[PDB]
């Protein structure tokens, strides 16, 4: 109630306070509890191999230098008071570009407690790297992590833990990625050893499963229909040289236009994807179909019936092996 | 243990400290040891001729003004104390855009030692220029360097060396470029002379080898199959004017669509790449194949047999010369 009394209490706390020294300097390491409330996962980029995450990052720790008596309330102070207090040097090891929202002010919260407990909240948008195994693309499952670590303080000076155990991270169900579904999330606590010493580590990982529905309609269906369309040449009479030859190449031309456009959406990985094998496989079938008429024309100037039996069978065999291998 | 005792020691060190004056001002040059821990090489851009590097940049030097006694510990201070200390004016000569990560704080470390040794660490993401010789593209090998130099202090005032010799740079094995493989890295120390004097220089260079697997499947295979597909016209009977003419142009059309799309991914270099020679070479073969039927049609209203022998042979000769020249 008495603002002057509160003002004197706060001024006393900051009087002689050294931001350069951590709480319990020279003593036991200070335990910092962290909880994350996920706001959204805006983007998942295969070309850049990273994802963008927006979250409410909160840290809990005790600073005896900030303990106050006589005020039975939790003091919610202006975010500018954080510049006069010690905060953990928490950083994200796998991030590529991060910032703190500053509209209309810095999205920062400082809440003190009578025993010296400090609640420090930040709203952070971060772009974190996530190496992706695209061998089974687009039927792949990805494990994107967020590594949380202290930059300068070793385990002798600071310690991290998930406040609330497995409930430390909330809002995962709110994530709505158009291309991915959040299968599971995990919380991991461990110690990482470097040349400068051992540092505490907290890891938040998401298992992402790509949605196959878009690629089935956009890519597989046009390729299947063109391959079936190439088999129409077998029904056509052998004397229709203009018709059958035009059918073979235009199907080949159709495959090229589909093949060129599809591969523009992905990075230059040297290994064979599931989509890569399918596009090239279809391009071979239409290529062989046109070759099939070449042998026909040369011999006549039987093979057709053999091809009519084999080509649908081989393509069905190719699909059966393909889908079993990746599903 | 005694925070007040530590506070007095630190305040004494910064009392009268002049950041404008380097250690041992007017005396022997201060030796600065540097070690780099690579975090990742995010991108390698041929169009922009640059690469993006994320690393932990650390500097080691001795400042007798910061020597303290009575405290047998290495003081890890808040990163904001770096603003009150002298640091080398280290800059990257070949960088295009660099920044220091600042989430949740500036990724900066200051660690003092009783003898005055200062450890100064920064997490830096830098985009450094790398001129690329694309004559042998995409079978080329690139040497991308990172030039480290003092901006204002000459060799009379400061000196750089790799702390740890050939082990000064770590984490190279962690680099996972989808398009490149890290063949080797080298550390070079030398002195560079300018109009304003001679300056110390440290160079970190990576030899990158482009992965050929992606381009073989995406580019070479479609071109080879189309060129083989053009030879199908030779099997076709000469009276099938509609069939053979349609075959020639559609193969030419297919080459144009492939050729236009491929060249969009590269800068406008005036010299002939390996891929450039191959695409134009294939476009000539399909062009000559259609010309081959023109002479046939005119004469008949033998050449076919000669072409059936020559065209596969010439294309095989073209491939044999091409691959031997670049591999």
């Amino acid at each position, epitope marked *: 109630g008495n603002m002057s009394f509160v003002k004197e209490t706060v001024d006393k706390l900051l009087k002689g306070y050294d931001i350069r020294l951590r709480p319990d300097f020279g003593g036991p390491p200070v335990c910092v509890g962290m909880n994350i409330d996920i706001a959204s996962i805006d983007m998942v980029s295969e070309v850049n191999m990273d994802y963008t995450l927006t979250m409410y990052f909160q840290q809990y720790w005790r600073d005896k230098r900030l303990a106050y008596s006589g005020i039975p309330l939790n003091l919610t102070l202006d975010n500018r008071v954080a510049d006069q207090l010690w905060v953990p040097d928490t950083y994200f*090891l*796998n991030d590529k570009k991060s910032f703190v929202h500053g509209v209309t002010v810095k999205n920062r919260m400082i809440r003190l407690h009578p025993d010296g407990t400090v609640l420090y909240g930040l709203r952070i948008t971060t772009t974190a790297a996530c*190496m992706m*195994d695209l061998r089974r693309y687009p039927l792949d499952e990805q*494990n994107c*992590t967020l*590594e949380i670590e202290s930059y300068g303080y070793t385990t002798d000076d600071i310690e991290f833990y998930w406040r609330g155990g497995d409930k430390a991270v909330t809002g995962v169900e709110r994530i709505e990625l158009p291309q991915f579904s959040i299968v599971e999330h995990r919380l991991v606590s461990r*110690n*990482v*050893v*470097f*040349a400068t010493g051992a*540092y505490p580590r907290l*890891s938040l990982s998401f298992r992402l499963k790509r949605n196959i529905g878009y690629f089935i309609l956009q890519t597989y269906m046009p390729s299947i229909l063109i391959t079936i369309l190439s088999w129409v040449s077998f029904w056509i009479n052998y004397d229709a040289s203009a018709a059958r030859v035009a059918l073979g190449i235009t199907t080949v031309l159709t495959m090229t236009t589909i093949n060129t456009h599809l591969r523009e959406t992905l990075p230059k990985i040297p290994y064979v994807k599931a989509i890569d094998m399918y596009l090239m496989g279809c391009f071979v079938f239409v290529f062989l179909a046109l070759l099939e008429y070449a042998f026909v024309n040369y011999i006549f100037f039987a093979i057709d019936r053999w091809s009519r039996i084999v080509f649908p069978f081989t393509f069905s065999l190719f699909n059966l092996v393909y889908w079993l291998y990746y599903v | 243990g005694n925070m007040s005792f530590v506070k007095e020691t630190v305040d004494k060190l910064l009392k009268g400290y002049d950041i404008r004056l380097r250690p041992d001002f007017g005396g022997p040059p201060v030796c600065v040891g540097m070690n780099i821990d690579i975090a990742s090489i995010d991108m390698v851009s041929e169009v922009n001729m640059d690469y993006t590097l994320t690393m932990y940049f650390q500097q080691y030097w001795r400042d007798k003004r910061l020597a303290y006694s009575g405290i047998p510990l290495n003081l890890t201070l808040d990163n904001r104390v770096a603003d009150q200390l002298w640091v080398p004016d280290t800059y990257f000569l070949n960088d295009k855009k660099s920044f220091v990560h600042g989430v949740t704080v500036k990724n900066r470390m200051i660690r003092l030692h009783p003898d005055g040794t200062v450890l100064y660490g920064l997490r830096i993401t830098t985009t450094a220029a790398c001129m690329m010789d694309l004559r042998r593209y995409p079978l080329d090998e690139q040497n991308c360097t990172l030039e480290i130099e003092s901006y204002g202090y000459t060799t009379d005032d400061i000196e750089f060396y790799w702390r740890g010799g050939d082990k000064a740079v770590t984490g*190279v*094995e*962690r*680099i*996972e*470029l989808p398009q490149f*493989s*890290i063949v080797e890295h080298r550390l070079v120390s030398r002195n560079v002379v300018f109009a304003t004097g001679a300056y110390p220089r440290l160079s970190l260079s990576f030899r990158l080898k482009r992965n050929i697997g992606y381009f073989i499947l995406q580019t070479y295979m479609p071109s080879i199959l189309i060129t083989i597909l053009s030879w199908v016209s030779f099997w076709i009977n000469y009276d099938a004017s509609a069939a053979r003419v349609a075959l020639g142009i559609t193969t030419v059309l297919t080459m144009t669509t492939i050729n236009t799309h491929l060249r969009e991914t590269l800068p406008k270099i005036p010299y002939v790449k390996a891929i450039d020679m191959y695409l134009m070479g294939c476009f000539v073969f399909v062009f000559l194949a259609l010309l081959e039927y023109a002479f046939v049609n005119y004469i008949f209203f033998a050449i076919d047999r000669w072409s059936r022998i020559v065209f596969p042979f010439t294309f095989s000769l073209f491939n044999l010369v091409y691959w031997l020249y670049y591999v």
Partner: nanobody
Framework: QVQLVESGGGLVQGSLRLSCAASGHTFNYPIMGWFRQAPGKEREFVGAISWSGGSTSYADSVKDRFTISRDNAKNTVYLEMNNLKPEDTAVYYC??????????????????WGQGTQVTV
């Protein structure tokens, strides 16, 4: 989950090739390190290689004598040991390391370990 089995280590007095087979989510653990534990001594680092890329790193004691190669298609890491010395009598282990597990030289940073072959020279 990654399962590691190493084989190819026998008793000799010589060139040896130790192979470490991997299975599971090997992509999440791209770095493979070789460790040996002499009796009465802590486990010692030998060499750490990456599944992808192929860049290598070796200890000073076994530099230019032990070479390691890997192939993702075979999903196996091969350690070739040449010019064997009596100090190389230890249980050789194969370990997998996470992408952001930190330093290579520290066995604690490694999560999945092999059984360990006993080699005496």
């Amino acid at each position: 989950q990654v399962q590691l089995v190493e084989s190819g280590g026998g008793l000799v007095q010589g060139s040896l090739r130790l192979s470490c087979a991997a299975s599971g989510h090997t992509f999440n653990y791209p770095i493979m390190g070789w460790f040996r534990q002499a009796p009465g001594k802590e486990r010692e680092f030998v060499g750490a290689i990456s599944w992808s890329g192929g860049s290598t790193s070796y200890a000073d004691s076994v530099k230019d004598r032990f070479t390691i190669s890997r192939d993702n298609a075979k999903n196996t890491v091969y350690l070739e040991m040449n010019n064997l010395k009596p100090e190389d009598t230890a249980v050789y282990y194969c370990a997998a390391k996470g992408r952001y597990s930190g330093g290579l030289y520290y066995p604690t940073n490694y999560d999945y370990w092999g059984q360990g072959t006993q080699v005496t020279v």
